[PDB]
Structures are given as structure tokens and as C-alpha cells.
Chain length 233, copies 4
């Protein structure tokens, strides 16, 4: 065991790494993207946030991988006469990792061919002809903005979504679920991912989000609480 666990019911920037537009509000909410002052989601916003202590996801000397689980509550709000864009994602990234492309890339990817050593679970609110399925989806991305697998997600605007993602070392099973307590709806997706193959032994852990790059496609991307836990060996 080489355990870690934390749980923030209110955020503070002192134990967080914030990149670009990410910020913690006076009410302790992690706000991944900008407001344009009219209280409106800024266009072309990109923000990432990670927990400040690196986590060891696997060990090359023992050949072991960690199991983990995380849960968070997010709220995405689209202003009137506008559409959702571009999405939000929880990600496991390399330690000094810097932001990538805006919009459809969720700040996590490039469309170039660099190995990003990134794994993420996205909550995609906008269709990208080139790789996205037709409907808003939850998706497991492994080194590409082209989800290795997905599930239809019925985006409800302004309602709090409760996510629960888990990875089991033995079965290599990654499983993401989401539920709208207000609507009583729920969605789940699961596929096997081999963390050792794509991820470095140590990674920073957190969120990434972007708003559409064109006028009428913007949404707020806020996380209200988060809890992570990882057990290695």
C-alpha cells in the first residue's frame, strides 16, 4: 500500500496547480473557464486544474498499477440563445504537462501525432464531425480526442451532475458513470485500459475544459467538489 486520498468540499488555490483561465471563486468553486464580465462564458476559454502532489499510478520496478476512484460534481450552464461547447474532462496527465489545443481538443490534445501520455474521461457537449459521435457523450480517451469508447449522455443544462470514475488494476477496467439527482437519469461507460502502456509512473491528476471557439457556443465549466483515492500495491 502506498495510499492517497483527499476530498475537497470547497476549493482553495493553495493546493492546486491552475493553468490558463482556471480559477477558484470566492465561494470555493473550481471554475475551469472564464466569464466575459457580462456574466457570460467567455469564448475560446481554456482552463486546467490539478492537485499539487504527483500521484504514483504504477511502478516499473514492481510492475504494479494502482487502482483508483474519484468523484466530483460539476455544473455546466449555457447562456440563453447559445449552445453547449466544448466540454469538460477529468484527466491523468504527465507531471509538468502544459495545456494543448482549445475548443474540441478540451485542452488535452493536439491532433498532431505526439504521444501525450494522457488518459481522460470526457463529457463532450459538442459534435466534432471529424471524430465525435453524433450525440453528446461521455467518453474514455486514451492518447487521442477520439474516444476509445463512448455512451450517449443526455446533457441537462444547469443541473449538477454527479460523476464517479473507477479503475481496477486486476481487471484493467475503467468505468465512468454520471447521474442527475434532479432528473434521476444515469449513464455509464466501461472499457479496459492499460495504464502502464500509456501513462508514466507519476502523474498529476485533475480537470481540463474549454469553451467553443465561435460566438454562440459557450458554457460554464464548474466543479463543486472532488475526491480522489488511489492504492498502489
Amino acid at each position: 500500500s502506498n495510499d492517497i486520498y483527499f476530498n475537497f468540499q470547497r476549493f482553495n488555490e493553495t493546493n492546486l496547480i491552475l493553468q490558463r483561465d482556471a480559477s477558484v471563486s470566492s465561494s470555493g468553486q473550481l471554475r475551469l473557464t472564464n466569464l466575459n464580465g457580462n456574466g457570460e462564458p467567455r469564448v475560446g476559454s481554456l482552463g486546467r486544474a490539478f492537485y499539487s502532489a504527483p500521484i504514483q499510478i504504477w511502478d516499473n520496478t514492481t510492475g504494479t498499477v494502482a487502482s483508483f476512484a474519484t468523484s466530483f460534481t460539476f455544473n455546466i450552464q449555457v447562456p440563453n440563445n447559445a449552445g453547449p461547447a466544448d466540454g469538460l474532462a477529468f484527466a491523468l496527465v504527465p507531471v509538468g504537462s502544459q495545456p494543448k489545443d482549445k475548443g474540441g481538443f478540451l485542452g488535452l490534445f493536439d491532433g498532431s501525432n505526439s504521444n501525450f501520455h494522457t488518459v481522460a474521461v470526457e463529457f463532450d457537449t459538442l459534435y466534432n464531425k471529424d471524430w465525435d459521435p453524433t450525440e453528446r457523450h461521455i467518453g474514455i480517451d486514451v492518447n487521442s480526442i477520439r474516444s476509445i469508447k463512448t455512451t450517449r449522455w443526455d446533457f441537462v443544462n444547469g443541473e449538477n451532475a454527479e460523476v464517479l470514475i473507477t479503475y481496477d488494476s486486476s481487471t484493467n477496467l475503467l468505468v465512468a458513470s454520471l447521474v442527475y439527482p434532479s432528473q434521476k437519469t444515469s449513464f455509464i461507460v466501461s472499457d479496459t485500459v492499460d495504464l502502464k502502456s500509456v501513462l508514466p509512473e507519476w502523474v498529476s491528476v485533475g480537470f481540463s475544459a474549454t469553451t467553443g471557439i465561435n460566438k454562440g457556443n459557450v458554457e460554464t465549466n464548474d466543479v463543486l467538489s472532488w475526491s480522489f483515492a488511489s492504492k498502489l500495491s
Copy 2:
């Protein structure tokens, strides 16, 4: 806080209440229903953890949040069909078994308030109340699930269940996944535990096999873990 938590990676009958055909194998598997190596017909078995759990408090008016997880394995013999199902249930303390088959051992079809809440894994259609397909369903005092979801039963594969109840939102959420098939199903609805359940309940499983020859399955739990936090 008035917490409880346990986790059995292997069962033993000393801290379990077994009813009817329930039993723990030499390998530590909770086997809810009977068998010469073939699932017995008309089998009924229930098993609960021996210490009652306080689900809610009338004096403080509070309800507990909880979560449980278990791995079960249902196996249908060749040239036979699945029947009747398996359910995780919260039941009154001295609760005794009810009807066989389609009632999963939990209900009657009479009008007694059973003060029972359960999440069923139904493997057989019962014209009178079941949906057409095999489903995961949330039952609140009735074998007629208050809500359900299509479940693609895979025979002999281990299913990993995760049920959770959140006191604040009253949200009950059941999910299942076949690590082998990489499939997953989820259901969620609001249940008010205070309304139907007594403050203290025994916690566990119930299962039955079909009452007619060709409808039988084994109903085995391989591991279980429960957790409840009151106040």
C-alpha cells in the same frame, strides 16, 4: 456519525443469518440456492449480516447514506433457462422468507406492507408485472419495480454490482458491469427510506429458482462489502 463498514472477501457462516437453502461453501462462497450439481427447482435462500443496521432515526429525523458492492455469479445449466433472480435487500430485523420463484423470497402479492426495499436482478419475465426484458430493478414494498433498466444477462460470467443511497438527495443508484464483456448498466430513482423502512434493518440477499423444471440458475455471491453512515 454512527458508522459501520465491513468487507468479506470470503464468507463464513458465523456472522451470517442463513434462511432456507442459503449456505456457505467450503470455498467461502455464499450460495443462496440449492443443487447433484444442478440448480434445484423451487429453491429459496436468504442471507443477512448478523448485526442489525440502523438505517434511520426517528428522534433526530435523520437517514443514513450507504453503499454496498458485491460480486455474484449466476450459472444456467445446459438446455435450461434463467429463473428466477437475485436481490440485495434491506429488510425488518426478524424478517422471515416470503414467496418462491417470481417473488424472489421477498414478496407476497398480498397486501401486507413488507417494509422492504430491494434491488433485483430479474432473470425471468412474469407477465403480470415484469417488463419484457431481463432487468435490474428497484423494488419498494412490491415485486413490481418502481423503475428498471434493460440488463443483458450473460451466463456464468461474474457481475460486479454497486448500489448507493444518498440521504440528502434520496437517490438510490444501482449499477452492474461484466468485466469480461466490458458491459455496464445503471438505474437510479429516488426512494424515501423513512417512509417504508423501520429504523433498524437486517441487510443482505435473497434469491429463488424457477418453480418449473427448465427454469433454474445458481445464485452465488462471491464477495460483499457494506458501509453505512448515520448522521
Copy 3:
């Protein structure tokens, strides 16, 4: 892992096994011993255990569980009276029934039956025959004659905070007590081999007695308890 954990910040009799005078008050306090007019009854004996048996060790795997528990008790002696006889946390055989009163804390006999009992006592009365001269915290293994002890400065009516822990690897049993009000603290530690004395499964809880003679009585109350055991 074959874990268990619980934590009662207020007792209720539904998940407890009460023996003799043990009882839970309307305020949810486990009261191990009686009253007669609101004064600790003489010759009282009360035991209380958590209702689900705990597996302390496994003969097939040869493993032993590590555990920890913590509770807050309060012993109060009435005016012009002396403390007696004591309170103890014990690991006992599953259907175990009470033993002798007074100095035996309800856990022992003075006969030579193997009681398969292990307990940590909080002794408030000197028993010439086996007790040390001063009030002590003691580790008892199958005998009311503690295998080891430490001076305990009993403060009357103040809440004591106990913390007992057993580590499988080192076989180290360690008991400590602190009076948050007085800022005092006491600790004892010795190695005990649970496999040698205890059965694989045991009931877990408390036992307490009041002196058998008029002016030796105290109340024996537990206010909160928390147990945790991890096997393998």
C-alpha cells in the same frame, strides 16, 4: 482483507449483547453496572458485546488480524465511598457467559479453566493476592493477574479517552489513556500472541463490576466506542 469497522457515538441495544446489569440509557450511554437510589449498586456485574462475531485469526491461513478500538468511559464514585472494582475491554469466546464479580471484573474465575480471554483492565481497587499496589491499566491474558501494568492516576468523574491497538506482525498490544481535562496520559505495551489464547472468532466488548462491600462502588459507563479489525 476481511475488514470490519464501526463507530458508535451513542448506543442502542439492538446491535449489542447485554449481560446481567448492563443496559443502555435513554441518553444512549452504555451503562455496564446498576444503581439501587441513583447510587452505584453494590455487587453489580455487567457485560456488553457487539452483536456480530469478529474473526480474530484464521487457522487455515495461519493469519492474525490487526485491530484498534477506542472508547470514552466515565467512572464516578459517590461521596464518602471508594472506587471499585474496575472496567475492562475484552475479546472473548462467542457465547461466553459472565464469570466472577468484584475483583474478577466479570471476566475471570480464579479456577484453572482456560478462559480464552484477553482483556485490558482499568483496575480501581487493590487486590492483595495479585494486584500491584496502585490503580493500574493492565493487560490480562487468561488471568486476572495482569501480564503487565502501569500506574494509572484515577481521576473521579472525568472522561477518560482509551486507545488500544494490536499489530499482527509485531504481536504488540498497546493501551493508552488520557484525561483531556487533566492533560495526563498513561500507556502500557506488551507482546501477546492472540493465536495461542483466543479462538478464531470472538465477541468483542466490555465487562465491569462494583465492589462487593458497601463502600466500594463506582459507576462504569461507556460513552462512545469504535472498533476496527483487518484480517489478512
Copy 4:
């Protein structure tokens, strides 16, 4: 709740802040002080902290966190040499840099700056000016002059198992230590008001030093550590 918990059964420098001679060995042991031969270097000073700041209290809600930590350390003195200077677990301000060597354990100055530091020391050397006569475990609050202490029978080369806990309600700080090999144990407890001395956020870890004179040196190694804090 704004919880945190971690547990390292083997150290790696990637989630640690190391200062001066602190280093993680190939075997994953946090070695707070240097060597040379393989002898403890004289005048060594090393500090190590967990990389994410912990919030110890909140000015807006006025709440303080309860916490607990446990670690196993091993201090070894070379033949024909004496222990010096000590080891300490400390809660320090976030960017905090090292202080004086030897007797100051790297945590203090002897000047009159508020160090906003709270530490539990395992002092192996008497310092006429402020130390008690015997080797002690002590609670330091802003000064190398422990606010309270307890005799500690240092056993050379044996693994010591420490357990420190802080309870927000009672403000009680309680440190204990046991040598599973010797079966000895020691405990100290006093009330400390974290809000009064500590900033809301602090880095958490260890500090240690070796004697500044030839014959006074020891190794200062931590073999495992686990911290836990619950705020509100």
C-alpha cells in the same frame, strides 16, 4: 469535511520537498541526514515535507482540523560516539526554509522571530540552556524549549513507532512512542491551540540534525509515514 490522507510504506522523492541533506535511499527510506565510511556526518541538517500544503485551520469558519500521523524511525549511533542531536515531526509555514543546526533541530533560531512552528521532538542530547536532563520526547510550540516533555529511554538502532494525534475539540496534542522490540512505551500530552501559532496552511514533515562536534552523531531515518487530517 476537507479531508486528506496518505500513507507511504516506501518513499520516493517525487511527492516530497527535500531540504539540505535530506534524501531518499534506493531502498525508499527517507534519510534526513548525511553520511561519509558510512558514518553519520557531523553538522548535518535535513528536512522533508509532503509536497501538497495541508490546511490546518480556516479563519473564515474559525475551524481547526484534527489530525493524526504515525511513522517509524530508526536512529543509529556509531560505536564510540553519542546520540546527537535529534529528530522531529513538524507543521511549518508553506515556504519555510531551514533554521539552526544541532540543538535547534533545524526548526528554531534562539532569536525572537515567530516561527509559526509546532513540532514534536525526539531529543537525544542535553542542552544545558533549555533541555531537561534526560533524553525526552517533547512538544515544542514556537521554541526549542518544549512546552512539556517526558523521559524517553533511547534504545540505539531499534525501530521506534510513533503516533501523534491532535483533537480540535479538546485542543489536545498527544505523542506516544514504543519500541516493539523492547516492549517499552512513552507518552506525552498537552493542549496546544493551533489557530494561535499556525497559519491556515502548512507544509508537513520532518526535521533532524546531527551534533556539531565530532563525537555526537546519529543517523535519522524514517521508514514509513502516514498522515491524516480532517477539517470541519
